[PDB]
Ligand SMILES: [Cl-]
């Protein structure tokens with residue numbers, strides 16, 4: 286009742302993964318694995334967290350954006366106006382030249398824009414962590430977008446929530 290799943294073991298109905306490299310082909314992926322348009326810049330595989338294939342691993346080898354995206358622009362439910370995007374993430378290879386985590390993006394337009402440097406130390410054990418991202422410090426297209434040139438991580442259990450799980454780490458707003 287607290288939450289709206291976006292990717293909890295499988296994509297919620299109106300959702301896709303989007304793998305967007307520097308090529309002229311953008312890939313909308315709804316299964317266990319995918320490649321970006323150039324077949325190399327951004328790859329998705331399944332990984333196992335709590336069940337077989339409940340996570341997705343993503344490997345960046347060149348400039349590319351991964352999004353978890355709505356099939357059509359969807360206004361943020363007012364239920365979540367002071368809520369959180371929650372997800373589990375494991376960063377197995379930190380980005381040498383950095384990465385951007387954007388949350389709840391419209392056409393022009395993200396609710397949060399977080400550099401990986403801002404939470405890199407808490408992720409540096411290369412273990413899974415539950416991250417709670419407060420949405421506030423118009424129709425939404427990308428629930429999340431991660432952009433980098435070189436990076437390896439995995440994501441699971443992505444949901445909008447009004448209250449962060451107990452063992453969550455809040456990516457609070459920069460001062
Ligand atoms: Cl990088």
Ligand SMILES: [Cl-]
Nearest residue numbers: 383384401402
């Ligand atoms: Cl960074």
